[PDB]
Each structure stands twice: as structure tokens, then as C-alpha cells.
């Protein structure tokens, strides 16, 4: 699972109101992070610089196979994280076109204390105008090979941070394809290394 020492993601989902485009609920395979640097902004704040500072056990790559097969409306994304510590977290998610940042969404969340842990919830947070328009134009293309061509160089960098210490708790890099199936989405999680 997607977990460092201080934070783990339990759930992540992008949806349309419900339709799931993309959903998530050791011995993960690895990916050399030097091979994907070009897929995310490379200067300061870059994935390379991020990796070199923050703990290397916090870095992950998720491959999604989206389910774009729906005719449904609210566009939202919901994720939830768990920690042993109580802290204030900032979730920063940058959408990237050919490695250049196109939208960045910054969210700051508190923990409710529930069962053994501190849980954090981003509940039904709305997609930006850009993303709706993107998914819309993507969804309505005449062929799946065209859709994968668009998705080829579409990526999202998600870096979650302890707002006070500025320490990075987990960093997830997403890459994309359309699902081969008529229905359903799939995913595959990787640990980012070296």
C-alpha cells in the first residue's frame, strides 16, 4: 500500500454524479525515479529535488486505467489519509501537461481522531474548470487509441506535506491510460526508488 512512516492513503477516487473514473481503496514493484523526472516540473520544487530532501520511503507512482464510459452533474475527487501523529497537512496536487504544470490545487486539512489513528479527509472536493473540460473532451473522443495518446503525457504530482515542519509525508506520481474494458477501472502501485 501507499504508505510512508507518517502517512498512508486509504482511499482515493475521482467521480461524476455516481460514476468512478478512477478509484483506490508489501513488495510493491519499483520504478527508477530518474526515468520519470521529465514527466513532472524539473526545476526548483521538482520531483528530483523533492526526492533528495524528503524521506525516500514516501515516494510512489500509481498507474491508473480510467473508466471513461459514462453518460452522466457534479465532478468531484475524494481521498482519505491516516496518521499515527496529529498534524496539520497540506495536500498539493499539480496537473502536468508534458511535464509543465497546468493546474495546482492546494488543500489544507486537520485530523479528526477516530479509532486508533488520526484520519484526514478531503471529502467531495470539486474538480477545477480545466479538469472538467479535459475529462469532457477526453471522454467524447471517437477512439480509445486517441484517448491514450492524449493521456500519454498527462500526469499528476501529488505531494502531501506537514505544514509546520515542511516535511513531506507522501508523494504520489500518477500516470494514465484508458481501461481496455467496457466498464471498470484498474490501478497498479509502485514504489519510486533511487
Amino acid at each position: 500500500s501507499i504508505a510512508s512512516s507518517k502517512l498512508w492513503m486509504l482511499e482515493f477516487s475521482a467521480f461524476l454524479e455516481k460514476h468512478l473514473f478512477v478509484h483506490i481503496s508489501p513488495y510493491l514493484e519499483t520504478v527508477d525515479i530518474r526515468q520519470i523526472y521529465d514527466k513532472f516540473p524539473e526545476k526548483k520544487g521538482g520531483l528530483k529535488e523533492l526526492f533528495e530532501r524528503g524521506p525516500s520511503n514516501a515516494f510512489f507512482l500509481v498507474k491508473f486505467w480510467a473508466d471513461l464510459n459514462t453518460n452522466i452533474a457534479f465532478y468531484g475527487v475524494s481521498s482519505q489519509y491516516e496518521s499515527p501523529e496529529n498534524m496539520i497537512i497540506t495536500c498539493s496536487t499539480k496537473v502536468c501537461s508534458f511535464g509543465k504544470q497546468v493546474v495546482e490545487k492546494v488543500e489544507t486539512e486537520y485530523a479528526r481522531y477516530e479509532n486508533g489513528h488520526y484520519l484526514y479527509r478531503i471529502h467531495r472536493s470539486p474538480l477545477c474548470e480545466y479538469m472538467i473540460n479535459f475529462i469532457h473532451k477526453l471522454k467524447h473522443l471517437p477512439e480509445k487509441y486517441m484517448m491514450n495518446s492524449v493521456l500519454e503525457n498527462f500526469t499528476i504530482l501529488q505531494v502531501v506535506t506537514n505544514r509546520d515542519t515542511q516535511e513531506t509525508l507522501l508523494c504520489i506520481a500518477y500516470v494514465f491510460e484508458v481501461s481496455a474494458s467496457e466498464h471498470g477501472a484498474q490501478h497498479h502501485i509502485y514504489r519510486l526508488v533511487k
Binding site: 501537461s97 509543465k100 490545487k105 492546494v106 477545477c128 486517441m146 498527462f154
Partner: protein, 50 residues
Amino acid sequence: DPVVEEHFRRSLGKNYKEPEPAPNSVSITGSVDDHFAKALGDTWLQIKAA
């Protein structure tokens, strides 16, 4: 309730949990269109025109 909040803010000082903490924002610096053109070229330009 901001009027209640004031009392608390004033009472706790450096122990006051901001009810909706910063930062928050959405910054958009790009056109979806420009992406499709780059991925699909003439094929995308043909579709736009219908």
C-alpha cells in the same frame, strides 16, 4: 459561528486552532485545448470543427 469563534480566538491565543486553515487555492495556468493539439495534432483540429 464567527462571533463565537472570536471569543475563543481571543481566549486561547497561540493555542487557537484556525477552523479553516491556510493555504488553499486553485491556480490554472494552461489551456486544455493546447494539450489536445499537442497530443493529436491535425486529428484534434478536425474534431473541434464539428
